[PDB]
């Protein structure tokens, strides 16, 4: 019964976690494409990278 409960709940827990991962990945690539022009320095880029990790 609690195996069935985990089957019922992980299929949206892991999907919300994948949406979190896609959101942080778009955040990191957007911070990279605002670093590459030259607006903000490399330390906030490393902060976005460690948040993605």
């Amino acid at each position: 019964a609690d195996g069935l409960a985990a089957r019922g709940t992980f299929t949206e827990q892991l999907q919300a976690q994948r949406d979190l991962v896609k959101a942080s990945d778009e955040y990191y690539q957007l911070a990279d494409k605002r670093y590459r022009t030259g607006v903000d320095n490399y330390l906030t880029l490393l902060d976005a990278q460690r948040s993605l990790f």
């Binding site: 957007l30 494409k33 605002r34 607006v39």
Partner: protein, 52 residues
């Protein structure tokens, strides 16, 4: 691609146009110290020679 806001771009474009207007207002004086003939015709004598 919407990295910075659409309002921060308006602030930066306003600062850019204010600085360009300051450059143009500061080269108006640099053109004023090159004193130009406002008309075209015969010129008389120089009542103020160079150095004064």
């Amino acid at each position: 691609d919407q990295a910075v806001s659409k309002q921060q771009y308006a602030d930066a474009n306003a600062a850019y146009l204010q600085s360009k207007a300051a450059v143009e207002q500061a080269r108006i004086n640099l053109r004023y110290t090159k004193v130009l003939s406002p008309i075209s015709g015969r010129i008389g004598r120089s009542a103020v020679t160079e150095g004064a």
